[PDB]
Design a protein around this ligand. Structure first.
Ligand SMILES: NC(=O)c1ccc[n+]([C@@H]2O[C@H](COP(=O)([O-])OP(=O)(O)OC[C@H]3O[C@@H](n4cnc5c(N)ncnc54)[C@H](O)[C@@H]3O)[C@@H](O)[C@H]2O)c1
Ligand SMILES: NC(=O)c1ccc[n+]([C@@H]2O[C@H](COP(=O)([O-])OP(=O)(O)OC[C@H]3O[C@@H](n4cnc5c(N)ncnc54)[C@H](O)[C@@H]3O)[C@@H](O)[C@H]2O)c1
Lengths: 318, 318
């Protein structure tokens, strides 16, 4: 039994847990030829987001029986080619709730306190910028949350109680008591959340309903002084509409951690604007969260290699 | 009765409150000659931090009876020259507690989530930096707070309960129950706080005891992975020792909002380091906080012009 690690895990504990039971090779940022040679006899595959497992590589893997992503996203795996051969594709979701909550708070406060802008002014000797701009006090301001899931609830709870913000939440599949629990108000009309909020943070599941649900019409309804925070999925925002919204000052700025596509091109049009700050899809990649997903990825590989049904099968039809 | 506004107030409501009762002139970023001409017959003076009121300008003001700073700092007023002439110098402290608390949280999270560093990597097309660095999960980490005053307590309360951090506090003039109230542990040995903390935030009163109390010896005791946050006063940190500490990687980085001296020179040696982020003394200058200090400054000017003792006299001997 051999296992191939396409990319390091977010923590080396999952790799030692696999080395104790199988023969493991690790390849960091490989070319396609390195994948083709190292996957022939391999029995389990781990894929580090967002590198891609294609139908050719899956076709060359003769003994392959289980594939594990590093986290929730499977948009880089050819699941169809893997189902045809009956290969188990496994996920690792929901191990980074606390990491993304902290990251959303960091970016909300960064936009409000004008962190990156004020930093360059002082480094460039423009201390006198404190006569033209001012930071935003969060207390009393309205935070609008799309998606009152695990992460959206946690962000709502902190901003309402610790930051004394007014929290509105939009989620068609949630009882209003869930909003009441975290001291938020559930709002059905998304226009109301858009027109009321000084800060809009996205935490919904990526579905056909939420795919590109934040487009130019939504940005137009938002306050020109409002900010957008996106730590969910890149496909929730129609990227060109976010460019127009920023360029035409339809919103005051944004902070995004997820992209479409991933990885983003080096010439992304959003990089130009200073009121838009980025992080390379790391809101859920803290050491504590990376250690959980790495262990979870190691278990599910071993469980399939031993004929046990792992908890997060993407294609249960095999 | 005329009043001179050396610099705009942090909000124009205090200026209208003075315009209703006196003749007001406002000068923005003046030369010394503009001050000399506009202060001769003036009866009240407002000074916007950190511009300086010198003994010459005070000497030329014949009808001057009250001086008000914009906030707490009076290190830019020649209080001695004003006391000689019996002029009331007035302060405006403690109106920005919530503003600085939010600002400290923003900077703590910014250092932990590596905000500014990860932002330039993505803008420079280095999305793959997520393979070399990782953000820090605050949960379980130790926050060390120097000065359990109004702001230090508020920061401690949020980081302990909302962020699930371990909070240690150093303050010789505070009962341990005050730390227990905000779910922190009061620590007498400052070495213990230095050696234990992953994040050190400064909120003490600037005294002879706290003047330059954070020097090279203190940085050496700190963890090389720890971060420094300074929203108190610039004189609490011995600036050259912070340069050596950063350059020699004695600490992982810093986030400072206050300087010594203020304003800082355009060629400050700290501007060079990327793990050091700045804001131009704005932690207490939110609109809500700026509106309070502006009203407070307007009242104390009018109260002296009407023979009423204002609450924040710097030189009560007049
Ligand atoms: N940036 C990262 O590294 C990272 C890490 C983990 C998760 N995420 C993403 O964060 C997002 C939120 O995470 P989660 O664990 O809390 O998801 P979740 O499953 O706990 O809940 C998401 C919520 O979305 C809601 N929702 C569904 N459709 C909606 C719609 N049309 N409008 C409004 N709300 C809708 C659902 O009711 C659900 O409550 C997910 O998209 C997840 O992929 C990102
Ligand atoms: N950046 C800004 O714009 C801004 C705005 C307001 C206040 N501040 C500064 O923030 C700092 C804290 O504000 P505050 O209102 O909470 O002050 P505070 O008066 O409420 O309390 C400060 C604490 O310092 C403690 N202290 C005194 N000596 C100490 C020592 N040797 N060691 C440890 N602790 C000691 C005191 O016991 C007191 O509890 C002050 O220096 C203030 O000037 C900055």
């Amino acid at each position: 039994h051999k296992v191939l690690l396409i990319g390091k895990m977010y923590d080396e504990i999952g790799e030692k847990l696999l080395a104790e039971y199988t023969n493991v090779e690790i390849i960091k940022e490989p070319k396609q030829h390195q994948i083709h040679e190292a996957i022939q006899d391999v029995s389990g595959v781990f894929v580090r987001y967002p590198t891609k497992l294609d139908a050719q590589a899956i076709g060359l893997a003769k003994n392959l029986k289980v594939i594990s992503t590093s986290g929730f996203g499977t948009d880089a795996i050819d699941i169809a080619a893997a189902t045809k051969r009956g290969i188990v594709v496994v996920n690792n979701p929901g191990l980074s709730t606390t990491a993304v909550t902290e990251h959303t708070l960091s970016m909300i406060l960064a936009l409000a306190k004008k962190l990156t802008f004020l930093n360059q002014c002082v480094k460039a000797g423009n201390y006198l910028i404190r006569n033209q701009v001012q930071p935003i006090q969060l207390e009393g301001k309205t935070l609008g949350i799309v998606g009152l899931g695990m992460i959206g609830s946690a962000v709502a709870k902190i901003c309402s109680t610790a930051l004394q913000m007014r929290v509105l939440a939009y989620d068609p599949y949630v009882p209003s008591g869930k909003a009441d629990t975290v001291r938020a108000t559930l709002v059905q009309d998304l226009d109301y959340l858009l027109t009321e909020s000084d800060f809009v943070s996205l935490h919904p599941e990526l579905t056909d309903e939420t795919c590109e649900m934040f487009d130019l019409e939504a940005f137009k309804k938002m306050k020109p002084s409002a900010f957008l925070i996106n730590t969910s999925r890149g496909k929730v925002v129609r990227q060109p509409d976010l460019v127009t919204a920023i360029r035409e000052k339809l919103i005051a700025g944004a902070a995004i951690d997820v992209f479409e596509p991933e990885p983003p091109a080096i010439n992304n049009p959003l990089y130009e604007f200073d009121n838009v700050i980025f992080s390379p899809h790391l809101a859920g990649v803290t050491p504590e969260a990376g250690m959980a997903a790495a262990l979870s990825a190691a278990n599910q590989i071993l469980q399939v290699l031993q004929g046990e049904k792992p908890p997060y099968i993407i294609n249960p039809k095999v």
